[PDB]
């Protein structure tokens, strides 16, 4: 009956009695009739001291009860922020669900535990997880009156939809892009360096996605942190058909980055003759110097692109 005495001590919060019982051979993973273990109970009542002890003595951080509740489900239910951080620390399942489909984030967002919510998200909690009733954490927050947590969850949702749109744009998944847009993703979002979905599509040469993004209000002249526009990226990677659509949709043909390089500079240095001819036809300044002083002609000569040098020398 050591199991009963360990369950009791864990619930009451008797730190020493927990150690005395474990030392005398108590099974750290015993369970009452419903399925709660010594860890479940210590997490339900908030005894951080016994939590750390039990984990250190071989407790299963992810034990389930009859209804599929885990220790993390409980600590998130009772608002004990310190215990949640430690359960995750030992490999607790941030997205473990119960028979109803409820995850810890459903619980921390239903009982107004702002800190626990942002801690769960940082560890990978899914804001779009739906329970058996079709409720996400954001739905339960609005049903109870936690409006700040609801906004935070909305923020994380848009943050996640934007990341997906950037990746879909890079990878060339026209279907995912168009659906992400129809779900409210910002076509103008930007990663840490300032690349928008239209930057990535032009860089990778996915013409179909360039067109879609532009038809949905994408900033054709958006600048990354280095001052590059999508046209800069299409010109130097050599995607002729994208350059034409970009220019047809308002692309500044004389945009300059932090180094003072225009698209013509990049097309001439990388040796894309057709794009050089198209840029000139659309108004590119043939004589433009970058901050170091080089013209596109000098860059073509530097790289042995004689055809390009000829065309630039004639347009000058």
Numbering used by the authors: 13 to 328
What does the paper say about this structure?
In this paper, we present a strategy to fuse specific, high-affinity protein binders to obtain multivalent or multispecific scaffolds of predetermined geometry. DARPins are used as building blocks to confer the desired specificity to the construct. A series of rigid connector modules replacing the DARPin capping repeats allow to combine the individual DARPin domains in such a way that their distance and angle can be altered to test different geometries, bringing the binding partners of the DARPins into a defined spatial arrangement. The two helices are not just joined end-to-end, but instead the two domains are made to overlap in such a way that the joining helix is stabilized by contacts with the domain cores along its entire length.
In the context of DARPin-β-lactamase fusions, we observed that the paratope of this DARPin has a high propensity to form major crystal contacts, leading to crystal formation under a wide variety of conditions. Indeed, constructs D12_Hxx_D12 with H02, H09, H11, H13 and H15 yielded diffraction-quality crystals in space groups P212121, P6122, P212121, C2 and P1, respectively, at resolutions ranging from 1.8 Å to 3.5 Å. Only three of the D12 constructs did not rely on paratope-paratope interactions, but instead relied on paratope-capping repeat or paratope-connector module interactions as dominant crystal contacts: D12_H11_D12, D12_H13_D12 and D12_H12_D12_H12_D12 (P21). The propensity of DARPin D12 to engage in crystal contacts is so large that, where the crystal geometry does not allow for its preferred interaction, alternative interaction geometries are observed. These are found as paratope-paratope interactions, interactions with the DARPin N- and C-caps, with connector modules or with the target protein of a second DARPin in the construct.
